[PDB]
Design a binder for this molecule. Sequence first.
Ligand code: GTP
Ligand code: GTP
Ligand code: GTP
Ligand code: GTP
Ligand code: GTP
Ligand code: GTP
Lengths: 239, 238, 239, 239, 241, 239
Amino acid sequence: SELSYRRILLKLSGEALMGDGDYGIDPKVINRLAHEVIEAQQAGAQVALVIGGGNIFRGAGLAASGMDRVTGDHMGMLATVINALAMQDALEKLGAKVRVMSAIKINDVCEDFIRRRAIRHLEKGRIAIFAAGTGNPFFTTDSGAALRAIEIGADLLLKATKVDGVYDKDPKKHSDAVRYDSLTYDEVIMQGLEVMDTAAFALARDSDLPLRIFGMSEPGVLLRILHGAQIGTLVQGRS
Amino acid sequence: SELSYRRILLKLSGEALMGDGDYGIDPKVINRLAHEVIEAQQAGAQVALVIGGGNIFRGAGLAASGMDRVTGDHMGMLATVINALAMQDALEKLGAKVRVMSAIKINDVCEDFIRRRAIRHLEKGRIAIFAAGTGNPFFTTDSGAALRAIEIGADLLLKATKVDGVYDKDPKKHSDAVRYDSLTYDEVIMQGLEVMDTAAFALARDSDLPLRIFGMSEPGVLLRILHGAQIGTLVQGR
Amino acid sequence: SELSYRRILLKLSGEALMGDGDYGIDPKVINRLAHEVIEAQQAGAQVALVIGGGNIFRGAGLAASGMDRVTGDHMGMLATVINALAMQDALEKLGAKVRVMSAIKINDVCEDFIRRRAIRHLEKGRIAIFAAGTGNPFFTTDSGAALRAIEIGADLLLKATKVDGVYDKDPKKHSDAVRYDSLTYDEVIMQGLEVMDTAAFALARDSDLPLRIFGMSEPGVLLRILHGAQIGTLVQGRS
Amino acid sequence: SELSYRRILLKLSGEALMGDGDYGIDPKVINRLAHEVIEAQQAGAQVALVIGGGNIFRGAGLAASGMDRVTGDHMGMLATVINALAMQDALEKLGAKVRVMSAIKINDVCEDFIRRRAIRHLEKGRIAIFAAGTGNPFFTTDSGAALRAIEIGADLLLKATKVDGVYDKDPKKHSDAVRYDSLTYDEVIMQGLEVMDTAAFALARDSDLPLRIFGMSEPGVLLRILHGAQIGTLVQGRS
Amino acid sequence: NAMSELSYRRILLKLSGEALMGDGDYGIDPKVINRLAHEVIEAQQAGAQVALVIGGGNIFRGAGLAASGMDRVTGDHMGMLATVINALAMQDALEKLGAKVRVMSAIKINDVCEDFIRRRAIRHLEKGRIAIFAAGTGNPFFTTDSGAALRAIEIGADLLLKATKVDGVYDKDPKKHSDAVRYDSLTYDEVIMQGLEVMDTAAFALARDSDLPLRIFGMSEPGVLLRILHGAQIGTLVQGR
Amino acid sequence: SELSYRRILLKLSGEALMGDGDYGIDPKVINRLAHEVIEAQQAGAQVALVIGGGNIFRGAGLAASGMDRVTGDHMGMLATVINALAMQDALEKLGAKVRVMSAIKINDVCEDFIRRRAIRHLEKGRIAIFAAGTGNPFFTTDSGAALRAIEIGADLLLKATKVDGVYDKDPKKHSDAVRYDSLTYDEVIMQGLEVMDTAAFALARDSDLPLRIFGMSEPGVLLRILHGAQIGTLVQGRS
Ligand SMILES: Nc1nc2c(ncn2[C@@H]2O[C@H](COP(=O)(O)OP(=O)(O)OP(=O)(O)O)[C@@H](O)[C@H]2O)c(=O)[nH]1
Ligand SMILES: Nc1nc2c(ncn2[C@@H]2O[C@H](COP(=O)(O)OP(=O)(O)OP(=O)(O)O)[C@@H](O)[C@H]2O)c(=O)[nH]1
Ligand SMILES: Nc1nc2c(ncn2[C@@H]2O[C@H](COP(=O)(O)OP(=O)(O)OP(=O)(O)O)[C@@H](O)[C@H]2O)c(=O)[nH]1
Ligand SMILES: Nc1nc2c(ncn2[C@@H]2O[C@H](COP(=O)(O)OP(=O)(O)OP(=O)(O)O)[C@@H](O)[C@H]2O)c(=O)[nH]1
Ligand SMILES: Nc1nc2c(ncn2[C@@H]2O[C@H](COP(=O)(O)OP(=O)(O)OP(=O)(O)O)[C@@H](O)[C@H]2O)c(=O)[nH]1
Ligand SMILES: Nc1nc2c(ncn2[C@@H]2O[C@H](COP(=O)(O)OP(=O)(O)OP(=O)(O)O)[C@@H](O)[C@H]2O)c(=O)[nH]1
């Protein structure tokens, strides 16, 4: 119809999946998220999802020290597959065709990431769900999210965080805090504002990937954003 | 030298790994479980390990009731790799050599189960840690476990569960069942006792695989069983 | 459709491919079976085949009494890949679209087995042919057939054998052997009647897989069955 | 030290395994052959084997007259994996160390072929058994043996046949059939003699591979040839 | 462009890697790469199903890479990888002109392109895609020509076109005989008999085994490929016995 | 014995292999390099090397500015396998044991990168050659070298460049220039000195990987460095 962003990639921490739970997934949250996503898709947007695995890579048993750093990242990556698999069902049950694609080979469980396939999947009206990040350890979920966004040539990367947008002085350690309507990559760096870890930000800044930091709490957000509403902060261009 | 069982495979429900917490794993039961395992290799035994994923694959959101079974089984498989890796890491810190092997290919994370390879690894005195069951959906963790046991030509499949063995009707409820110090295969079927699901039990039976249902509550239980200790039940023969 | 069952899985022993020879494939038998299959498909049936390998993996040299059981199972598995390849070329000679899918990776030769892919193929009018059982040793052709049936959500698993159905008394012992029309998994277990090995039978038992044991003596029979013919013995139900 | 040839590749047809039978493998024949291979390997030879598949890929059912040639060849390649597996067993029963290596990937069943791995296996004293030819249709087993020979740096390529060497006229037509002791590659082609198919013969020639065509007529033949004995025909050099 | 004008339906066109070089001494001349792409697209528009095979000699060259005493196999792998690079270049030039391309490799490099599967390759031809085949047969010791003939037979091609410097097969060396003539056609046998070079022995036999029609010609001027496809007697045709 | 660094990763440009050429590999530059590496080896160091592909993926034809960036990065990754394959040949000629590992699967040609395998190889005294960077487009060779260095627990990442260290200005037109002997990561950032691209540096910063930026002008610099010598610039520390 009238979209301001044709192809998008929505990334979330996955702790966000837990909800008020302390672990795993909360059927309530995943149900709303799947619904948000399905509205986006129906509206005409080719949608891609990235979801971290922090809801599963939890506890002293797992996330506590000693654990070989590489081994923990591998585990984390498996966790994001499990999550991707749950979004796949929740969504298909609701009529969408889903294509989970993993940055590491686990062919039994889901297909391999291949840029040319992914694009064709988005073009056919399917939801792309990416898992396992970039495929290497030492890279955050934002990095893989950025990379994937750039590969598929997305119009916008949506990073859903607890705080809705970027603020000057914490929406807590201040009452007067104002939400930047928009920012350039440089304005961010110059003002020491932090959005994604250095590497992930550089990656996004080299391709000038439109970023949007925002909440996700209120239903209909994707629909507003797709239709133009200035929601959260928008990171774009290079001053 | 001088053991009742030379190549062994130890099977845990994984939900075991949780112990205190309701999810994931607690380092306590892991470290100790690793020790029990180290100790067997010390004795001079060839050890295999298979652990479930129900500790990571749990909760309403993940193990949803109206959930596709395959999707769900894949998730469980994945869960078992996670636990497999945790054990690898814990076991390696204590200096032991290990080899995690997956029934479904995930080479980034660990090698593929290759029968000739898993065996070879045991001969070099490494601990084989198998994950992802048989790599098929609809098969229990028991099935995968029996399969691998037969595969490596294991002398003994050890299943650690809640109850300390195989009881007629269970402990407490009905003049405290007498723990059969043994029980042929056909006997288990005739009497309709539970050990493993039909399919798993059938596999184990067909190759005449010595079972052994027991509890790992006291530390040192494994070292004893190997020597000759008659703990828990022991399923065998016809 | 114009037939009761639409998505079915037909399983033969493959020894049932040698006809009157003592090892190969019999052009008679395979052309005859091709027509049956082509016919059903032409009537809207989504057909999957599983054919064993006892016609290739035979002889003292190959099925040596001793011999590593695992390496024997691997020969049987490859045997089924060869049969499937033959069933492919025969079906394609008659204008059918075929997808052979093996449970062990041999991608040069035929496509890997992937549940989602297989269904797709089926709902596209193609004949799916599965080879190499469950991909595991110590598992019979039937287990592999039950597994695939459940996986693809077939309405019926047809197992073609010598004895047409199941009888109370042994049909070669008594002339007064009675053939049941139907039976429940319990009724079979309890009467200690044998239709598949324990494992295979159990697998299908956990999914109430509608089994049909029958003899593929004369042509037409496959089509009659899809219409509702009380041929052989139906096994279905937890009763 | 006493050897005229340290690394050799011995190629046999698949029919060489059947014995008097009309299919599969004769336990007694594969045993002799195994014994002869051990005798060589113990005298300090490094041995690669290549066995064809015509003992399994035979009969009007499998080797159908007008079947798809690619499908035909793939069936054959699978036939060879089955033979190599049987050879492996036989050899291993008698304490030999063995590595089956396939030209197409079937990792479940046997390891992949990789030139560096293979040469290494040979250095360690293992018997190398190569299956599936070149991994391509339209190429013969002879071509696959020639290829493997060059890749592993064989000192000699042996091709075991029914007729002990190359005779001017078939040793059944004119009773005065004379055997050649040595022939250049060019002499063979010149005399229109039929040793290997054109492509395989050219690979042998261009790679400078001495080639001995002989029959395994009696025990100890392989070992003798290994010590320089002139049995059968030697194809070497150019004109 | 009337499909009724097609003398050949499915073709495989084969070039040496050096062709992409043009005047430079290395790699790819974008001038050359574009004209090739234009010729190919032109053939596709006439209704042809087009398969492509380009060697790696433009990249695997120089004392350093192709050193006289290096390991023959690693050398061949190098060429194979060169071939994958060329194919990607072609993929990008063709796609930029609106063509739909599928690179397929004889050795698995799945990040980079799909691997060769016969039945897949054929379906791509059916759907109107240009197939670009890389890495020969996937084995060392086989020439590009060998991979080319294999692929041609495997996809059921009506013709294998090998582009070379010389514009056909002459009865005699034209650089040595002024009376030398270009054959319009030759049987596979007449080539052997007259000791004429067309492909190395192994690749010729494989082509000969399946009676693959071959057309040896020179891509000297634009439009030559479309003319061949419309029946032009250009270069030399090898076919039959 | 001595040795101030046990496990190193030496990273080269690629064009560094060209020498007096405009493309490819100068066999002179490659041999004295092998020599340097082999010397570092024969002194007890465990050596991993990473070489770019700029010598091969260049010229408007290959490195076309208007070309799809992903497929260009892929061409680059392939060029680095070629380079790796040539180093391997030269080093083995001089008697070294070499393991070439690529970040994207190409098993025919070399092995996959697997962190535990690479460590093992390094413990058995083999030279590890890493090709294809991280396996993702949009990532530099630096990024790849930093990753591998961390993954393998390198004690030092050497980066050979055009000039002999980090300077406060261009030393080729300025005899004025001041070379820094050592810098902290945070110093490099605030002084705006270019060492690596931002992502690579952050990747290197997070694990506090010791960097040694130096020029391989004269034979023996590698060895000297291994022995404590203070050549080029050292980057390290978090002040
Ligand atoms: N687990 C797993 N699933 C796969 C793989 N490849 C494809 N699939 C799934 O199989 C289903 C259908 O397979 P595809 O082969 O992608 O079929 P397609 O022709 O693109 O799609 P349709 O047009 O919908 O038939 C999809 O839902 C994919 O998610 C794989 O390698 N592994
Ligand atoms: N993630 C992963 N690790 C692997 C894989 N294959 C081997 N490894 C690990 O790499 C390490 C050593 O590799 P190996 O291939 O065993 O090397 P090796 O030649 O046995 O010689 P040893 O290390 O002495 O056995 C071990 O920790 C293995 O578990 C794989 O496919 N994936
Ligand atoms: N041998 C082999 N064939 C394959 C493999 N994957 C796909 N195919 C074959 O490729 C051909 C078609 O390619 P697909 O990948 O199915 O293409 P698709 O768009 O679903 O389907 P079509 O509509 O049939 O073109 C069929 O003949 C398949 O059997 C494989 O791994 N091995
Ligand atoms: N089926 C199959 N077997 C394999 C594969 N890789 C190795 N093997 C077998 O595994 C056994 C030994 O494992 P390897 O990894 O070769 O061990 P290795 O350390 O070189 O050599 P050894 O330990 O002396 O065997 C041998 O019998 C191999 O044939 C494979 O990919 N598939
Ligand atoms: N690099 C790489 N690309 C692949 C691979 N497999 C498929 N592709 C590409 O993915 C894209 C689409 O996949 P296909 O699955 O072939 O789609 P299809 O539906 O026939 O055709 P379209 O929808 O018309 O593109 C194509 O550009 C293929 O080149 C692979 O293994 N590696
Ligand atoms: N091309 C390619 N080569 C491989 C691959 N895996 C191993 N190799 C090579 O094969 C050779 C020997 O196999 P390895 O399995 O490394 O043997 P090893 O037991 O580690 O011990 P060595 O024989 O001492 O090297 C080595 O040169 C490895 O480079 C692979 O996947 N592809």
